[PDB]
Design a protein around this ligand. Structure first.
Ligand SMILES: NC(=O)c1ccc[n+]([C@@H]2O[C@H](COP(=O)([O-])OP(=O)(O)OC[C@H]3O[C@@H](n4cnc5c(N)ncnc54)[C@H](OP(=O)(O)O)[C@@H]3O)[C@@H](O)[C@H]2O)c1
Ligand SMILES: CCCCCC(=O)/C=C/[C@@H]1[C@H](O)CC(=O)[C@H]1C/C=C/CCCC(=O)O
Length: 351
């Protein structure tokens, strides 16, 4: 019985509370010496932390698509690992695999049918990109823009992206330029993030919402108004952006992270004054859930991989090390510690 470390949900912060590292706890358990037919033993390499996990910390998540985590039970989420032993007829030792339901544990015995084999060449060997820009967040940005943005090459539209220096946002602003937007302006929470948006990611301008007059900066950077708003944050920032959105414009409602530590149903309605603007200007604001478009996942991943391999898509991530830091990593991402996709490195043992 090998000793492995795992992370379990130690306490719930409450639907109206703030998540902290201590809501999680790391403990040791013994691993089976026993691998059954159809099972594989995997060594975890990278785990993801993501904003949607904030609702899994609640007793009731709010929807049918995601189940709540249970107290004292191992937590799970997107992960990537290497097969160390296989008794599954279609997986081999050394294969790299992923699952959206990877337990937060150093080594695990899993049913082979619950795993997907990945192709390292799609990410030039950066397996953690499968949890990000060449994964669910990048797919969310691409499909969201393609389905809800209404952008065409040649229309010279202006796109504003909130949460611009995060996983979805950093990819969304780039895709905005790839697909036809002439101006892409990002709103984020730090000066350093602002610098990266314009120096490395091709944004035309960057606004720090903690230090800048957002409305004033939107008037300067979006001189022709806002035609597409890729929204990751909601709250006051979105109210400000919507106030400068043009006739027949579109809000790609990706997420509303500024509201995730509150019991308001998702997506939160707009205040009467802001909703009045939306109605008067015919601004579209529809829900967008990436799981409603799984038939576009394969072509999407290939397109994201191709843009990366062509040297056009810049992939940003922030890494924290060690399973003992999962809770800290989730708390850090929720409060802005990350540039690009937040990842936790569990191990680099691949040989
Ligand atoms: N629709 C879907 O299918 C789908 C799929 C995946 C993700 N999403 C959504 O997309 C958003 C981005 O997800 P992601 O994974 O890319 O995470 P992310 O942007 O990498 O990380 C979350 C970022 O949110 C910002 N933030 C946190 N609290 C905030 C607040 N009160 N106000 C303004 N900004 C705040 C922080 O950056 P700053 O320093 O800039 O504050 C932080 O780094 C989330 O709303 C998520 O729920 C939707
Ligand atoms: C809002 C928000 O940020 C949503 C995140 C989603 C994600 O992109 C895809 C969804 O299911 C949410 C949660 C994570 C994955 C597990 C569900 C897998 C499946 O049911 O196919």
């Amino acid at each position: 019985a090998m000793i492995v470390q795992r992370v379990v949900l130690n306490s719930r912060p409450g639907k109206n509370g703030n998540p902290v590292a201590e809501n999680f706890r790391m403990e040791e358990v013994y691993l089976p010496d026993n691998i059954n037919e159809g099972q594989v033993q995997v060594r975890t390499l990278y785990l993801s932390v993501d904003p949607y996990m904030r609702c899994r910390m609640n007793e009731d998540t709010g929807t049918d698509y995601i189940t709540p985590w249970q107290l004292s039970q191992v937590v799970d989420g997107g992960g990537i690992g290497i097969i160390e032993e296989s008794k599954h007829t279609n997986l081999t030792k050394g294969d790299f695999v992923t699952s959206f339901y990877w337990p937060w544990q150093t080594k695990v015995i899993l049913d082979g049918n619950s795993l997907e084999k990945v192709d390292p060449q799609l990410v030039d060997g950066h397996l953690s990109y499968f949890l990000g820009a060449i994964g669910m967040p990048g797919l969310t940005s691409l499909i969201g823009i393609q389905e809800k943005g209404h952008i065409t090459a040649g229309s010279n539209k202006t796109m504003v992206v909130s949460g611009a220096a995060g996983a979805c946002g950093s990819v969304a602003g780039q895709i905005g330029h790839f697909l036809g937007c002439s101006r892409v302006v990002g709103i984020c929470g730090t000066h350093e993030k602002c610098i990266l948006l314009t120096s490395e990611l091709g944004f035309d301008a960057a606004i720090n919402y903690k230090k800048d007059n957002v409305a004033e900066q939107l008037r300067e950077s979006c001189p022709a108004g806002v035609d597409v708003y890729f929204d990751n944050v909601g709250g006051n920032i979105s109210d400000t952006v919507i106030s400068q959105m043009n006739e027949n414009s579109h809000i790609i409602l990706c997420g509303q992270i500024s509201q995730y530590n509150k019991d308001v149903p998702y997506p939160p309605p707009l205040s009467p004054a802001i909703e009045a603007i939306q109605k008067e200007r015919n601004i579209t604001r529809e829900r967008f859930l990436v799981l409603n478009y799984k038939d576009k996942f394969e072509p999407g991943i290939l397109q994201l991989s191709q843009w990366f391999k062509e040297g056009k898509l810049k992939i940003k991530e922030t890494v924290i090390n060690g399973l003992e830091n999962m809770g800290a990593a989730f708390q850090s991402m929720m409060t802005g510690g990350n540039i690009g996709k937040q990842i936790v490195c569990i191990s680099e043992e691949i040989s």
